[PDB]
Amino acid sequence: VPREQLARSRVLVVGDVMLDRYWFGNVDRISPEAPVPVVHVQRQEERLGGAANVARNAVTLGGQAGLLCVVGCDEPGERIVELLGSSGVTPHLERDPALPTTIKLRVLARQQQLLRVDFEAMPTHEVLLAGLARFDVLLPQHDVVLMSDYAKGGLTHVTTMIEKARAAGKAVLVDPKGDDWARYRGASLITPNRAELREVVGQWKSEDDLRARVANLRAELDIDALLLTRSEEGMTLFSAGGELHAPALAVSGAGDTVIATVATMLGAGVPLVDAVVLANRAAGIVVGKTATVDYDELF
Amino acid sequence: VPREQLARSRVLVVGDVMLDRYWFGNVDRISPEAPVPVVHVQRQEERLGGAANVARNAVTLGGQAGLLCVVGCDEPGERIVELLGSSGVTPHLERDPALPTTIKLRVLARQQQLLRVDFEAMPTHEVLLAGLARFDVLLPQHDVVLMSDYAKGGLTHVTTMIEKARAAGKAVLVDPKGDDWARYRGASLITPNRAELREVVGQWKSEDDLRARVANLRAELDIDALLLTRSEEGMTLFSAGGELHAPALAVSGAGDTVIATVATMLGAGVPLVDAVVLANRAAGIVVGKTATVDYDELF
Ligand SMILES: COc1cccc(OC)c1-c1cnnc(NCc2nc3cc(OCC(=O)O)ccc3s2)n1
Ligand SMILES: COc1cccc(OC)c1-c1cnnc(NCc2nc3cc(OCC(=O)O)ccc3s2)n1
Ligand SMILES: [K+]
Ligand SMILES: [K+]
Numbered sequence: 001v002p003r004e005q006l007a008r009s010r011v012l013v014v015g016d017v018m019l020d021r022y023w024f025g026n027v028d029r030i031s032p033e034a035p036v037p038v039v040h041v042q043r044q045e046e047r048l049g050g051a052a053n054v055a056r057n058a059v060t061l062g063g064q065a066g067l068l069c070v071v072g073c074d075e076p077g078e079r080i081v082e083l084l085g086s087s088g089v090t091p092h093l094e095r096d097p098a099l100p101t102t103i104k105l106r107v108l109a110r111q112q113q114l115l116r117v118d119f120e121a122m123p124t125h126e127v128l129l130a131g132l133a134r135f136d137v138l139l140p141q142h143d144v145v146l147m148s149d150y151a152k153g154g155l156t157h158v159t160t161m162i163e164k165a166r167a168a169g170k171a172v173l174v175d176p177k178g179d180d181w182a183r184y185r186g187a188s189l190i191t192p193n194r195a196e197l198r199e200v201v202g203q204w205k206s207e208d209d210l211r212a213r214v215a216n217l218r219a220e221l222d223i224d225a226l227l228l229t230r231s232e233e234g235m236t237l238f239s240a241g242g243e244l245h246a247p248a249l250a251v252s253g254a255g256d257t258v259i260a261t262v263a264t265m266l267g268a269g270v271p272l273v274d275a276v277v278l279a280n281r282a283a284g285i286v287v288g289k290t291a292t293v294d295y296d297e298l299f
Numbered sequence: 300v301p302r303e304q305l306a307r308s309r310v311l312v313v314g315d316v317m318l319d320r321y322w323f324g325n326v327d328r329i330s331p332e333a334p335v336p337v338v339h340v341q342r343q344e345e346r347l348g349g350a351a352n353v354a355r356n357a358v359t360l361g362g363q364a365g366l367l368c369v370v371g372c373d374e375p376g377e378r379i380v381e382l383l384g385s386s387g388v389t390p391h392l393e394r395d396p397a398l399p400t401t402i403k404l405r406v407l408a409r410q411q412q413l414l415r416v417d418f419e420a421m422p423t424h425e426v427l428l429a430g431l432a433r434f435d436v437l438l439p440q441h442d443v444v445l446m447s448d449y450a451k452g453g454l455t456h457v458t459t460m461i462e463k464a465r466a467a468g469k470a471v472l473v474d475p476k477g478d479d480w481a482r483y484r485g486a487s488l489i490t491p492n493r494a495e496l497r498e499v500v501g502q503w504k505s506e507d508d509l510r511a512r513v514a515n516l517r518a519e520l521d522i523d524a525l526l527l528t529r530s531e532e533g534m535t536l537f538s539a540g541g542e543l544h545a546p547a548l549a550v551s552g553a554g555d556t557v558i559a560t561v562a563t564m565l566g567a568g569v570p571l572v573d574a575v576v577l578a579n580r581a582a583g584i585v586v587g588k589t590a591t592v593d594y595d596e597l598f
Contacts, residue, residue: 023416024415025416031412031415033405033410033412033415034415036409036412036413036414036415037414038415038416038417039414039415039416039417040417040418040419041416041417041418073375106332107414107416112333113330113332113333113335114335114338114414115335115336115338115406115413116332116333116335116336116338117324117337117338117340117406118324118328118337118339118340119324119339119340120339182342201540269387
């Protein structure tokens with residue numbers, strides 16, 4: 001794929017944005033107030049998480065990406081904005097002064113976690129409808145929409161967003177979250193892993209059992225295709241015209257990398273099966289480094 | 300004491316400033332990455348700590364207070380500045396862009412601590428000498444100096460500061476920290492508790508044993524008086540002209556309250572024994588509420 005063909009590939013990433021933050025410290029003593037460790041923090045690292053990382057991958061492959069999401073009026077909010085600007089992602093953020101920007105803080109010492117700390121809230125109804133209005137404006141400016149769900153509240157109106165995108169002839173990719181997929185109704189492609197697929201469809205016993213177990217799930221959800229990631233076993237694309245398997249070639253943030261690759265490819269006008277094939281090579285690489293596959297490495 | 304007599308009582312608080320911060324959250328699940336709790340934080344509280352709280356008490360009694368200390372060029376730095384301005388304390392901060400502002404973060408859930416997190420560093424030699432220069436300028440503008448030690452690095456040059464203050468006929472009060480008190484040499488009054496006194500002087504068996512155990516410690520440190528706080532047993536002022544005991548009348552931040560009261564009183568020109576007496580009443584109150592005794596309650 002010419003780097004100028006996918007240069008005009010426009011992907012609109014929509015969903016839950018967050019900041020993955022880490023504190024590394026030393027624990028030498030116990031607190032005088034409680035029977036708990038004391039962590040003298042020596043350094044802090046951070047990277048874009050959630051939908052933000054998904055959008056990060058579309059750019060490094062040579063394409064363009066936009067991020068429709070909600071942040072708060074706080075420090076991590078400012079930080080995401082800065083981190084977005086320095087990664088090539090066009091930001092389309094709604095600000096909720098009452099919302100804390102989603103952040104997952106890990107506290108570590110001796111290369112071991114002691115605690116995880118979350119900051120998160122449900123966006124106000126007012127804010128969500130504002131974003132939905134932005135989606136209307138942003139839709140025509142893009143070739144494919146990517147729904148990155150993390151159950152934080154950003155994809156409350158995903159069903160509506162999907163039906164608007166499909167009505168404009170734009171593909172809708174969904175990175176799932178949870179056991180309720182009724183909201184993903186009408187989506188072009190949905191990309192769960194083996195664990196994620198179960199809780200919706202249950203456990204199975206043969207690729208012929210899994211085969212039909214996927215067929216009806218696609219049939220009752222107006223979902224045209226399902227891309228099942230299987231780690232060691234590779235991927236399987238269940239498209240109603242057939243199936244396509246792709247083995248590995250060699251771990252974190254790989255799910256973000258595969259759906260971003262498929263999205264940016266489709267936007268570049270490359271066929272689905274080819275897009276899925278490329279998503280496998282991109283997958284085989286980021287597991288060898290979070291990471292973002294460049295244009296030079298993929299081809 | 301007329302509220303206009305102590306209105307012109309000027310206390311220069313010097314030492315380690317910090318921010319006491321608290322996170323209250325809910326813990327419902329275990330992290331997918333580690334066998335550690337996940338704390339969804341719902342609210343945050345904070346108050347001035349260290350030397351800052353000591354300076355806070357001098358103002359609420361009607362007097363004036365100044366704070367010579369070191370903060371960093373960060374968020375908690377800004378926060379202390381704001382918290383100082385809204386408490387009546389004249390700030391005299393040195394900024395160290397390489398230093399993290401000292402903060403003690405408690406994470407809690409279900410009214411129970413899970414972890415404490417510290418941010419702290421040693422001030423650069425350059426910064427410490429800058430502050431010492433400020434002390435020279437600030438000394439004449441005050442009636443009494445208060446050394447609030449927390450072993451964070453702010454009182455590296457305390458011995459010099461003490462000998463300069465005493466040379467100008469200004470009292471020097473010391474709130475101790477640790478087993479090395481050789482640095483407090485030349486101080487007017489030093490205010491440890493029973494636990495703090497031991498590690499320097501060891502354990503004792505009779506007020507006559509403790510009596511002489513204090514006498515020599517005062518004699519080898521050019522320290523004129525020691526105010527021993529004994530909780531339930533009250534206080535004892537060991538001044539070489541005699542002793543003075545003051546029983547309780549009825550818990551946290553009480554040590555800050557007693558030494559602040561003594562300091563602000565001496566600055567108002569009230570005698571030592573009277574100042575110590577008043578420090579007992581101030582003590583008997585804050586244990587009934589951190590807290591700051593007002594002028595209306597003390598008298
Ligand atoms: C995250 O991927 C792996 C993880 C473990 C072992 C692996 O194979 C040696 C892989 C791997 C490496 N390269 N290709 C493949 N095959 C296709 C893929 N399987 C997965 C599975 C993924 O997530 C697994 C999960 O969510 O548990 C994410 C991306 C891919 S891409 N799998
Ligand atoms: C912090 O004070 C108390 C703590 C526990 C019981 C108490 O008596 C009922 C007291 C208390 C209350 N009111 N007056 C007094 N007596 C004089 C004082 N003892 C202490 C002891 C202090 O700290 C004790 C420590 O550091 O462990 C701080 C201030 C005073 S003031 N003690
Ligand atoms: K990686
Ligand atoms: K109190």
